[PDB]
Amino acid sequence: ATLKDQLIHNLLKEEHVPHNKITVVGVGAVGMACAISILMKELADEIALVDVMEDKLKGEMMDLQHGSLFLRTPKIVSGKDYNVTANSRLVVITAGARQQEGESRLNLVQRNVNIFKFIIPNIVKYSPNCKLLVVSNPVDILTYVAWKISGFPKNRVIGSGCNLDSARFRYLMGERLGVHPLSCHGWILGEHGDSSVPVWSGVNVAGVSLKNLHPELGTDADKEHWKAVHKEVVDSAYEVIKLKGYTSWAIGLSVADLAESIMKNLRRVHPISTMIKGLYGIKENVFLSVPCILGQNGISDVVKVTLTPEEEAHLKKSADTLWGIQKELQF
Amino acid sequence: ATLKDQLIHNLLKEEHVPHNKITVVGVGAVGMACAISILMKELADEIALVDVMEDKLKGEMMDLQHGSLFLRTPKIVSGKDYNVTANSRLVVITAGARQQEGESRLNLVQRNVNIFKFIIPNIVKYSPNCKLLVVSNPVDILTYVAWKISGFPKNRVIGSGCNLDSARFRYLMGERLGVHPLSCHGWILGEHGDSSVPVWSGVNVAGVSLKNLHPELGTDADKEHWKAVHKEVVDSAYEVIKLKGYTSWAIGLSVADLAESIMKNLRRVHPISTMIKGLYGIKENVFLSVPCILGQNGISDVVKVTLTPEEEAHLKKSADTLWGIQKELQF
Amino acid sequence: ATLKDQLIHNLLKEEHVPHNKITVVGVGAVGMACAISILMKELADEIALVDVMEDKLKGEMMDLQHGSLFLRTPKIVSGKDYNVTANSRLVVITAGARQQEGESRLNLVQRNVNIFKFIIPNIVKYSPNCKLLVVSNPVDILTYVAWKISGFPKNRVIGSGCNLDSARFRYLMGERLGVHPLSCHGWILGEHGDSSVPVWSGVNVAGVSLKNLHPELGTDADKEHWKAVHKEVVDSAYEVIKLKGYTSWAIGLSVADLAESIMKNLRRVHPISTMIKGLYGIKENVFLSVPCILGQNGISDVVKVTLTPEEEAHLKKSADTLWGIQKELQF
Amino acid sequence: ATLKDQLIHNLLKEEHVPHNKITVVGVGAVGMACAISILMKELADEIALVDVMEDKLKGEMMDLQHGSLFLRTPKIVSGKDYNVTANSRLVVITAGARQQEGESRLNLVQRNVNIFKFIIPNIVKYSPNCKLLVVSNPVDILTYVAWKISGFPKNRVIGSGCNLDSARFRYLMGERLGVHPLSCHGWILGEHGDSSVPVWSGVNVAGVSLKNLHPELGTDADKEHWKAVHKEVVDSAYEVIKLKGYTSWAIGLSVADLAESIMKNLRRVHPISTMIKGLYGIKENVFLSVPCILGQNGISDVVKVTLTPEEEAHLKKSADTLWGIQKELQF
Ligand SMILES: NC(=O)c1ccc[n+]([C@@H]2O[C@H](COP(=O)([O-])OP(=O)(O)OC[C@H]3O[C@@H](n4cnc5c(N)ncnc54)[C@H](O)[C@@H]3O)[C@@H](O)[C@H]2O)c1
Ligand SMILES: NC(=O)c1ccc[n+]([C@@H]2O[C@H](COP(=O)([O-])OP(=O)(O)OC[C@H]3O[C@@H](n4cnc5c(N)ncnc54)[C@H](O)[C@@H]3O)[C@@H](O)[C@H]2O)c1
Ligand SMILES: NC(=O)c1ccc[n+]([C@@H]2O[C@H](COP(=O)([O-])OP(=O)(O)OC[C@H]3O[C@@H](n4cnc5c(N)ncnc54)[C@H](O)[C@@H]3O)[C@@H](O)[C@H]2O)c1
Ligand SMILES: NC(=O)c1ccc[n+]([C@@H]2O[C@H](COP(=O)([O-])OP(=O)(O)OC[C@H]3O[C@@H](n4cnc5c(N)ncnc54)[C@H](O)[C@@H]3O)[C@@H](O)[C@H]2O)c1
Predict the structure, then answer these.
(1) Are B94 and B31 in contact (CB under 8 A)?
(2) Do the annotations mark residue D45 as ligand-binding?
(3) Which one of 3.40.250.10, 3.90.400.10, 1.20.1250.20, 3.40.50.720 gives the CATH number of domain B1-161?
(4) Rounded to the nearest whole angstrom, what is the distance from the C-alpha of residue A296 to the centroid of ligand 1?
(5) Of A16, A66, A180, A192, catalytic
(6) Which of A245, C208, D91, D331: CA 20 to 30 A from C280?
C-alpha cells in the first residue's frame, strides 16, 4: 500500500550498467568546469566524481544533482573509493597541486607525481579499457607518468596538451583579423607551457598561408609584431592566474571538445600530448603536443606536420627541456 | 608512399564497434523525418538505413552523407541486407503502406503484417538486444505483431502510440490557454486512431485540474467545447493527409523524443503502446497507449492512471475496437 | 598595406548592434555559473559582465574569451562602468553578500539593499527596456527593492524565486518514485527560504494526484514521510554551504532555464518572484513565488493555483514573514 | 466565468513583435528541409512560411505546429500574402522550378526569373532591412537577379552558393584520408554548378598543404586521381537526383549553417555567392562563390584567396560562362 505501488506497476528491474560513463577525478576549479561543460554537451549518461576531500565532493555532487531537472544525465555519483569509477569509457584527471602566482608548471612535478602513483593503479583496476585524459600540470610530464604506471597502450593515454594553447592563439588571431576563431587556423605545438612552438608556416584563413603573404610573420625581429601573439599565448595562464587566481572556463570547454571527439568517435584532428618517439628525429620517450586524429579508441593516428627548420628546431628544444625532467623521476 | 602515408602516421587498426547505433527501417517520408531528427539531436554514433527500394536508399544515404560537415554522427550506412543493422541499441521501423485520403489506419493491417513477417526475424537475428520502436500503422496492432514474431520480452517492443496524439493535444490546449505546449499537461491514451481517449480527469496547468475549475470540461455536452479539442486530435492526421498527402515532421520529432529517453536512460513517462493485459480490466492481449516509464531497457514500468468511470469505459471500448481487428492472426 | 588589407577586402563598417544581449551583474560564483550556463545554451549574441572588483572581472572575462572557439557568442565584454550594458534585453543581478554558514538569507537584506541603491539606476538608464532578473538574496525582498528603485512596471522585474526550490523538490520526488525530475510535477511557492510552501494538492506524475492516492501525503503527520522531502528542500542550501561553502551550479542552470523562456518568448510557467497584492488575500506589497507565465516582456500573467485551506494559510504566513522584514524601507 | 479567466490573471497583453524572425519562401523539398534544420538549431523565435500552393502550405504549417512540444520556436505562421513576412531579419528563398534528370541548372533561368520578378518586390516591401539568402537554382544568376530588383546593398543579398559544394568536397577528402570532414579544409569556388573550381593550392589537414607533399594533386593527368574527387563533387547533384529525384538534406543543413552565422553574427568565413566586380580582374557584374566573412549585416568582407594561374584561369572561365547568361536577361 505504498504510494509507489499504487502508482507504478513494475515490469522490469534495476539493470544498472551505463553505456556512456565518464569519470572526473578531482572536483576543484578545473574538475567542476570539466564536469559542467561535459554535462551541458550531453556526452554521458553517467558521471562519476572522485576526490579525497569528502565534504567538498559530496557538496558539489549535491549542487549538480539539484540541477537534474535541466540536465540529460540521470546518474550523478561520487565517492572516495574507486569502485564508483567502474567501467568508465573516459577518465578525466584534474587532481593535483596548481600554480601559485609566477610559478612554473614544472615546479608541480614532485607533488603531482605522488598523486598519480596513487590514483593511476586505482583507476586502471576498475576500468581496464578506459581512455585516460590527463589535465593536471605539468600535463606532458604527467601524461608520460600515467602511461608508464597504467601499462596501457599509447593510444589510450592522452594529455589535454595544446588544445587550450591553440584555442587562445585562434582567438588572438581572430581579433587581429576580425574573423571568428573557428575560421583562423593556427597550431600551437610542443609543451603546454613556456617552450610551446607556434607553426607559423601553417597559419591560414580560408586556405591562404599568412606567411606567403607576409614572409616576415613569425620567429624574428621585423613587423606588425605577430610574434607577440605567440608570447601572449605563453603569458595568458600567468596573467589570468594573477587576475582571478587560477584558470578554469577555457580548459573545461577545451576538455568537453576532446571528450566529444572521443565519445562520438568523430576522428577529429587536435593538438594533444602523445608519445612522439620515432617522429621528429626525437629518439626518446617524450610526450608533447602534435596534431592527432582522436576517436573511440583514443589516439589512432598522428599527422606529420611539415615543419620548417626554425620550427623543427624549437620543437626539439621543447622536447629536450621536457625529457631533462622525465629522466630524473623513473618511479 | 600514398599522400595518406606521408601525411599520416598510423598507430592502430581496430574493430570500429558502435556504442550508440540506431537503425531506421524504411527510408520514406516518416523514416527520413525520424532520421534527420535523430541526427540533429546527436543521439547516435552510427545510423543504418534499410529499405527494399535500392535507388531511393542510396540516394537518401548520399544526401544525408554530404551534410556530414554539419552533423556529429560519423558513420551513415545502408543496405537491403540487414547485416548493416548489427549491434543496434534501437531500431525504428517505419516500413510499409500509409493511408490514402480518408483511409482508416486499421485498413493497412493486412499489408503491413505481410512485411513484418519478413523484417522482424531479420532484425531480431542481428541485434539480439535492441529495443524495437514500431511506427508503421496501425501502430498498436503492429507492435503486438512485432512482439509476437520477435520472441522479445514486452519491455523491448514499443509502439510510438499517443506520444504524438498527446503532443497535438497539448499544442491545441496550449493555443486556447496562451501557454506553450510544455506547460500544458494532458494525455491521449488508447488507440493511436479514432478510438483514442482524452483523459480530462488529468489535464492541468501548474498542478491545477481544469476539470476541477470547469466540471463540465470535455466528455460533457456543455459550453466552451473543450471536447472539440479531442475531435481535432482525432481528425488531425486525416486533415494533414488531405492537404499535403502524408504527415512526417511531427512524428519524426515525436520519435526522436522517445529515442532520447531510451539512449540516455532518462526514465521519462510517455504515453506509448504496450501490452495492457491485467490493467484496467483488460482480459485480451492488446497493445495500446498508457503512460509508461521509458529507459535503456525499454518500458520498465507502466503508471496506473486513475480514470473516471466514463474514461475507463472509453478505454475498454478502445481495446474492444482493436481486438475486433486483432482476431485475424495471419502470421 | 597590412597583412589584413592583403587578405581581406572590406565592403562595410556599421554599427555593431546586439540583438540578444545579456548582462551579468556580479562575476562571483553565482554570476559565472549563470554566465557559462547562458553561453552553453547559446542564448545571447553578446554578454556583458560588470563587477566592482576590477581584476577578478578582467580575469573571468579573459578566461571566458579564451574558450571563444568553443562557444557561439562572438562578443564578451566587461567594465566597472555600465556604459557596457547598453541595450541589454535581460540583466541578471547576482551582486552582493551571500550567507555564511548557518545564516538566514533574510540577514543579508541590509547589505544588499545598500548595493541595489547604486546598481539599479545605473542599469535602468542604459537598457530602458530590459527585463530585470534578480538573483541576490533575500531574492523576494530585493526583487521588491529593485522594482521600487527602478520605476519599472512589475512585468519586467523578476526574482529567480522557487524555480530552484521546485527543481530540488522534483529531484527528491524523482528519487523516491524512480522517474526523472522532468516527469514529476510539483511546486514550491512563497519565500525562497525557510517559509516556502510545498503545494501537495498539485504534486503529480502523469496527471495523477499523489494526494488523491495517499490522502495522508505531506502536511500530514502520517506514514512514509513525504513531508521530510519539503524539509530537505528547505535545508538543501544550508547543507551545500556547510560542505562546499556556497551553491552555484543549480542556480546557474535554473537561471539559464528562465533566461531561455524570456529570450525565445516561450510563454512557459515558472514559480518566480512577483508582486502578489490582490491574489490569495494578500493586502501588502510583497513579492514571492507563484506560478507565472514568462515571455519576451517578462511576466505577462500569473496562474491562480487552487490551494487547500492549509496551503493558503501557509502562503499567507510566508508573505507575513517577508512583510515583517520588509518594513525597514532603507532606500 | 471562462476556464481561462478562472485560471489566469492577466497583467500584460499581446505584444507581438519578434526579435529573431526568419521567413522561408517555398515550402517544397528544400524549403521544408531548410525549415526543419533552422527550427532544430533554435535560431528563430518566429518562422513565416510562404508558398502559392495553399493546401500544401497550410498542411506543412500544421505538421510543424503538431511538433510544437519538441521545438523552441513558439510562433509558426504561413500565408500567400507577404504581410506575414513583415520584419524578418532573414528571408530564405527556395521557390522555383527544379532540375529534371540530366537537366542543367542553367535551363531553369526563364521559369525562375519570372518567379523572382514577382516575389522580390513583395518581400522587400515588408522587410526593407532583411538579409536575402537565395537558394533557388541557378543560384548565382538568381542572386544577381534579387540584387538587381530589390535595390539592396551588395551585403544583404547572398546566394547559398558553394557552401554545399565545399561540404561534399570535405566529405569526399575526409573519406580518402580517414579524417572527419570538419578537419579537412578544401574550397570549391565559382559557380554552384558544372564550372566550379577546386582550389587545390589551399587544401590541407592541420595546416599542411596537400599540394607541397603531392605536387601532382589537381588539374592534370597523373596520380592517385584526386582530380576525380572534384568531378564527383560536380556529378553529386545529378547522381542524387537520378537516385531519389531531388536533393534536400544537405542543402537544408548547409542553409542552417549560414543562417546561424547571420543570426548570431559570428563572422565566419563561407564560400557564398557575392558580387565580384573589381576582384579577380573580372570587370563585370558577376555573382559567384568566394570566401566571405558573413554576419548580422550579411557579407561584410570578401577574403582574397591567393590563386594559382591554373586556378585563377578556371575562375575567369566560370565567371564568363555565367555573365553570358546574365547579360541576355536584363528584366
Ligand atoms: N592542462 C591544462 O591546460 C590545465 C589548465 C589549467 C589548470 N591545470 C591543472 O589542473 C590541476 C587542478 O587545478 P585546479 O584549479 O582545479 O585545482 P584545485 O585546487 O581547485 O583542485 C585540485 C583538486 O585535486 C584534488 N586532489 C588532491 N589529491 C587528490 C587525489 N588522490 N585524488 C583526487 N583528487 C585529489 C583536491 O582535493 C582538489 O579538489 C592543476 O594541476 C593545474 O595546473 C591544467
Ligand atoms: N505512428 C504514427 O503516428 C504514424 C505517423 C505517421 C505515419 N505512420 C506510418 O508510417 C508508415 C510509413 O509512412 P511513410 O510516409 O513514410 O510511407 P512512404 O511510402 O513514404 O515510405 C514507406 C517506405 O517503406 C518502405 N518499405 C516497404 N516495405 C518494406 C520492406 N519489406 N522492407 C523495407 N522497406 C520497406 C518503402 O519501400 C518506402 O520507402 C506508414 O505505415 C504510416 O501510416 C505512422
Ligand atoms: N536566489 C537563489 O537561489 C540564490 C542561489 C544562490 C546564491 N544566491 C545569491 O547570490 C548572491 C551572489 O552569490 P555569490 O556566491 O556569487 O557571491 P560571491 O561573493 O561569489 O560573488 C559576489 C560578487 O558580487 C560582486 N559585488 C558586490 N557588490 C557589488 C556592486 N555594487 N557592484 C558589482 N558587483 C558587486 C562582488 O564583487 C563579488 O564578485 C548572494 O547574494 C547569494 O546569496 C541566490
Ligand atoms: N542552391 C543549392 O544548392 C540548391 C540545392 C538543391 C536544390 N536547389 C533548388 O531549390 C529550388 C527548389 O527545389 P525543391 O525540391 O524544393 O522544389 P519543389 O518542387 O519541391 O518546391 C518548389 C516550391 O516552389 C514553390 N513556388 C513556385 N512559385 C512560387 C512563388 N511565387 N512563391 C512561392 N513559392 C513558389 C512551389 O509551389 C513549390 O512548393 C529549385 O530551384 C532547385 O534547383 C538549390
Answers:
(1) yes
(2) yes
(3) 3.40.50.720
(4) 25
(5) A192
(6) C208
